[PDB]
Amino acid sequence: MDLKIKNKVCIITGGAKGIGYGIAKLWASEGGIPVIFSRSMPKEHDKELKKLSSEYEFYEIDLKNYEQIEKLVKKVAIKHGGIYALVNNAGTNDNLHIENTSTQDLIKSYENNLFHYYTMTKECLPYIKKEQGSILNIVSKTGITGQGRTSAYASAKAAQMGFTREWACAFAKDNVRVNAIAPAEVMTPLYEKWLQNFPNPKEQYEKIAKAIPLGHRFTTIEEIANTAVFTLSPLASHTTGQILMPDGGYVHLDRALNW
Amino acid sequence: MDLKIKNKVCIITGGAKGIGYGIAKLWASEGGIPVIFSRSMPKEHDKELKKLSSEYEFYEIDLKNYEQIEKLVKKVAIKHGGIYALVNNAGTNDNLHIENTSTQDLIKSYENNLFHYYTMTKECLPYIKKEQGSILNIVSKTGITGQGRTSAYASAKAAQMGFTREWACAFAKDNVRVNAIAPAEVMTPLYEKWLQNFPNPKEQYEKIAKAIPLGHRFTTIEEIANTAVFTLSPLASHTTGQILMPDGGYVHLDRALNWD
């Protein structure tokens, strides 16, 4: 299947690790040019991305600094001639519960998880409109389902679903598509380290994983990336405003399901 | 992108024309083997599918005949060694409004549009489970949004969304994925024929298409097929229970949206 993304530039925030890095590698392996906006880039990942895409670039960026985003997005467009797509992905679940988190720390969490989806999209939009490209917002099941001790992350993820619908409305006339992917449980190196905090890591994994109908196992980075890159590509040219769940059935299947 | 469907068999009901045929062609272009279950097969379409896949087959079938379905699904599995996927797609919008349609005629509509989704899936399931394959139900925006003068079609399409969720639950343990695609307005030769019946076909098209946010134009068969075949493939290996809308924004974006 020819995704028709050869030499198309995609900026990926938080693209140096985890889901974002999986999207970056697949974008490059399909002929696209990934541009990584992250605070840091592991040297081994820089090496692999360079092997996959000779025009790939890493831009060291503090996504809480709006002026740095404006400067760096413009440098990307100058270097490459334009931008076809943006994947907003930087952020983490910081488990900030309302009952012991101040409003000020909610806002600090939004600085880390929410506001740069807006700033990045604002600055990329003139270029993405010119190329009739794509915006993809990586969100989370938690913005749909809740979780119970993570008010700041849950509301940021839902806000980004709202941006997805709003920007889909705003730019459909421009033939710019705007979609989101809501992963549920995705195995990443960071998740693996978290599981290793537990007295029995395999037991904790199985405790979480048994609630996933399809295979009682976490989604893979590859599975998220496959749907992300297909959705960004022109082969998904009438898909907009969608919140996509490649999640093993986590959101939609009967909560009581078991083996 | 390597979809990893080389030599995998997919049965497509209503696969001789329109959306089903687009799925069949793309399945074959990507290395899969499409098997078409329909009442008839255009000669030119048979020629094109054979050009794409020497093992493609057309089986003439009355999808209201459950025993013929049983016998022909078995024939496919014997011939090819198994079945990886099923696309349930046969049916039409017959615009049967409740106020002037008897319950008997509702049921006759279900014979045309609904019951064979169950029968086909029942008979394919042992084979698809063995191959840890995929079931894809083609439904319609109308099962979600309603329309207003098509009770039989709307309820059949919604019933099939129910089957999608139920079968996803039933066979997740078997690593069988079950999903649906809900197209909105898809340009097909059948749609073009329907439009040509109006005194002003262009204006009728534009009246409908102006309500589609992405481009004020119908979805293409290729757009439906691309999402269908990707979803069927092992690359969507954690996608199940989904009702997918490649639809230009028809279901989800503000109904008031316009280009002003």
Residue numbers in the entry:
A (entry chain A): 1 to 259
B (entry chain B): 1 to 260
Paper text:
To provide insight into the substrate specificity of Cj0485, we solved X-ray crystal structures of this enzyme alone and in complex with NADP+. The apo-enzyme crystallized in the space group C2221 with two monomers in the asymmetric unit and the crystallographic lattice generates a tetramer with D2 symmetry. A Cj0485 monomer from the apo-structure superimposes on an apo-FabG monomer with a root-mean-square-deviation (RMSD) of 0.9 Å (over 246 matched Cα atoms) revealing the similarity of the folds. Furthermore, the tetramer of Cj0485 superimposes on the tetramer of apo-FabG with an RMSD of 0.99 Å (over 1003 matched Cα atoms) indicating adoption of the same tetrameric organization.
We also characterize the putative dehydrogenase Cj0485 through crystallography, enzymology, and multiple biological assays to confirm its function as a fucose dehydrogenase, which we have named FucX. Several aldose sugars in both d- and l-configurations were screened as substrates and Cj0485 displayed substantial activity on l-fucose and d-arabinose and with low levels of activity on l-galactose. The Cj0485 monomer adopts a Rossmann-like fold comprising a central seven-stranded twisted β-sheet sandwiched between two trios of parallel α-helices. The holo-enzyme’s asymmetric unit contained four monomers that were arranged as tetramers with identical D2 symmetry to the crystallographic tetramer observed in the apo-complex. PISA31 analysis predicts this recurring tetramer to be a stable conformation, supporting the likelihood that the tetramer is the biologically relevant assembly of the enzyme.
